[PDB]
């Protein structure tokens, strides 16, 4: 398998004032649990 975001580390924002907050548990941490 728009909005402000940030990856890595580089960030970007949009004039619409919308974003998405990160999870506490990253994919790696989940993989560790499983």
């Amino acid at each position: 398998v728009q909005y402000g975001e940030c990856l890595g580390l580089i960030c970007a924002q949009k004039f619409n004032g919308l974003t998405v907050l990160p999870p506490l548990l990253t994919d790696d941490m989940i993989a560790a649990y499983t």
Binding site: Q2, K14, F15, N16
Partner: protein
Amino acid sequence: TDLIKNQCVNFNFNGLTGTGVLTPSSKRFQPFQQFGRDVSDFTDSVRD
């Protein structure tokens, strides 16, 4: 006037006004285009 690049500044380009941070780009504008837009209805870039 002159302008400051890579800084939050108030702009008033002939026919275009607003605020933001102006940075150089490589968008393949056509000879008959002045400015472009994002997927949303907001100005994305302008030709000086």
